[PDB]
């Protein structure tokens, strides 16, 4: 296959569905990228997680750099080998964690120096380190390294974070570009900033289109804003980036969110909720999420959805499960998080079809309707 | 297959191989028996436990009393099918765990009342009620409801323990026996007693065999007396049980006491130590175990042992398994506890082949030698 190729196959509005092809595998989208923050996606082995259907998988470059460390990795032979998932992997800046994980945080036009939340040692990141890191860690798809800006924001200081996230995004493509390998091998991604305001995000696209990526994301959503206004947002936002690069929205998950930003053009995203929220009892169905741990399924003897047809559901009650989780079971984690990443591929399944079939508008409409 | 049958393929000295055949599947023997311990192997999938060559686990009837509860998991179907594991199932009478675990406990020869652990609940054990629950359970392999002695023991006290064992023996019986569905499908395993004084253990022995059972558990060891100390009991208290039956030592895990005890006679085992060391950081090898946190296992490429065959050593590197255990992952545990309950199943596979094959003294020794 080629380093990167993205292709449309079909479209509904400004919904679409087609493929990104990469050396290392297909990927479908709209995809749905489960987390594996540190080298691991929470309790579950990798051969699991394809079981669910993933075509590929996001790694954290924060938590990574911090242990086992990003030159211990590339030691061992890089995050594939490391983990035991041979496909396509996708690692964010780490930008976004050192903001909101680190602590003692000295930011910059150089970058940012940080302390770790694990201990007291001292960090650096930047555009060029960031990138490294990503090489190191073999990573497929590079996330350029930016500035994030908090919710809410002013005219003035999302200009700033924006302007300097573009300076930002300047200094990653030649980083990236200057190592052969990596620029021969990966794909590299830019960011868009511009908070909820639609000039900014004009300039930001404007900017990134300037430079020119494999990708773009539309980051600074997700943190508080709502879902209104970040549909808003995405209204007049990804109409801006280039149609024929995948749009990548960062950080959403939850189903009617996905179904929303899909209706608006994004082909990409990643969540922890599946993970997460599996964790600690709340199981996603397609008549809404149940809380597993909740009296009324302690002699349920039906699977967690009445559909789904991932493994847990095809051999494990909701009664069992309820059991695992109040007894604080690692089985509980287990099963939990496999339903929950396996419903979240099969929702990016159905909108595939749909969108293939010219149905997709009906799709998201029947989806809300049972859903809520 | 027949309700229960035991056969002796080969000997070597007082080690024996063999089968044992019940309903829901063959036993082979010398055999060890994983803890699931609240309804669940802990980190492992029912699949995954059956992978490693397990053909029978053990269920805790204390734990599982407690929650979700003996009635609950009947009216659920039993715990094979609650569980998700269709092979037999001996489960522990539930005495030990009352006495180790739970408070306020009020003994009688009637039974004992106590309070969970988990809240303050109050609950009740005897013979009769101990057979019922393992009944509701759906248990294949029934042990009888006993008085455990703690170590050290005075002759009178464990004469009196001893001696009350074996009027509960009878009643669990008769219990087994006048419960028609369970006599007829399941097996009840009696439970030997006298300390580590050989006259109470012929007592026992004579008490036991009178009555009859299916199977001889050589209990009350394994709690504190020292490997030496319980082999010179295991000598001659092995050879006072019926030679055709099978003969389970209770609690005794640790590679090396499984060897010795099967060269004294024993046929099965069970042990939380593959399980609990597991999720600790202690993985087996032949070289004796180690501990994955170690910062020597931080870069090291080798799977946990060089010769195991099990999923965990052909896909992961000590490195990576070190990673996961010092950060607390889910993962760490879930391949730590595949691997050294594989490795258990794999010490069986060579104690059943040497014995056949006539060379088990030898096994026995070239295993030490290297082990320690
Ligand atoms: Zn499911
Ligand atoms: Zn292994």
Same mark, same amino acid.
Request: no cysteine; aromatic share 2%.
């Given at each position: 296959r080629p380093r990167f190729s993205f292709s449309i196959a079909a479209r509904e509005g400004k919904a679409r569905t087609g493929t990104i092809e990469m050396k290392r595998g297909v990927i479908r989208t709209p995809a749905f990228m489960p987390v =594996? %923050? +540190? +080298? %691991? $996606?929470? +309790? /579950?082995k990798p051969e699991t997680v394809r079981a669910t259907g993933a075509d590929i998988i996001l790694g954290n470059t924060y938590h990574l750099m911090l242990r086992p460390g990003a030159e211990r990795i590339a030691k061992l032979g890089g995050l594939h080998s490391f983990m035991g998932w041979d496909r396509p992997i996708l690692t964010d800046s780490g930008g976004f964690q050192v903001m @909101?994980? #680190? @602590? /003692?945080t000295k930011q910059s036009e150089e970058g940012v120096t940080f302390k770790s939340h694990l201990d007291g040692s001292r960090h650096m990141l930047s555009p060029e380190r960031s990138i490294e890191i990503q090489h190191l860690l073999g990573s497929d798809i590079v996330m350029a390294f930016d500035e994030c800006t908090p919710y809410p924001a002013t005219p003035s200081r999302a200009a700033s974070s924006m302007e300097r996230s573009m300076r930002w995004a300047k200094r990653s493509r030649d980083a990236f570009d200057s190592r052969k390998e990596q620029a021969e091998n990966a794909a590299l991604f830019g960011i868009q900033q511009g908070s909820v305001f639609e000039n900014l995000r004009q300039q930001s696209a404007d900017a990134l289109a300037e430079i020119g990526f494999d990708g773009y994301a539309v980051g *600074?959503? +997700? $943190? *508080? &804003? =709502?879902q209104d206004e970040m549909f808003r947002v995405l209204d007049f936002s $990804?109409?801006?980036?280039?149609?024929d690069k995948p749009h990548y929205l960062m950080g959403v998950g939850k189903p009617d969110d996905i179904v929303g930003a899909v209706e608006r053009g994004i082909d990409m995203f990643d969540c922890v909720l599946p993970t997460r929220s599996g964790r600690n009892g709340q199981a996603f169905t397609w008549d809404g999420p149940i809380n597993?741990?909740?009296?009324?399924?302690? &002699?349920? /003897?039906?699977? /967690?959805? #009445?559909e789904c047809h991932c493994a847990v559901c095809q051999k494990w009650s909701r009664a069992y499960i309820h059991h695992l989780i109040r007894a604080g079971e690692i089985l509980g984690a287990m099963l939990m998080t496999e339903h929950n990443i396996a419903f979240y591929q099969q929702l990016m399944q159905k909108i595939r079809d749909s969108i293939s079939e010219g149905r997709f508008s009906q799709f998201a409409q029947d989806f809300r309707a049972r859903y809520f």
């Open positions: =594996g %923050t +540190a +080298a %691991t $996606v929470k +309790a /579950l @909101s994980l #680190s @602590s /003692l *600074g959503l +997700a $943190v *508080g &804003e =709502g $990804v109409p801006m980036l280039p149609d597993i741990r909740n009296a009324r399924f302690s &002699e349920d /003897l039906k699977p /967690l959805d #009445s």
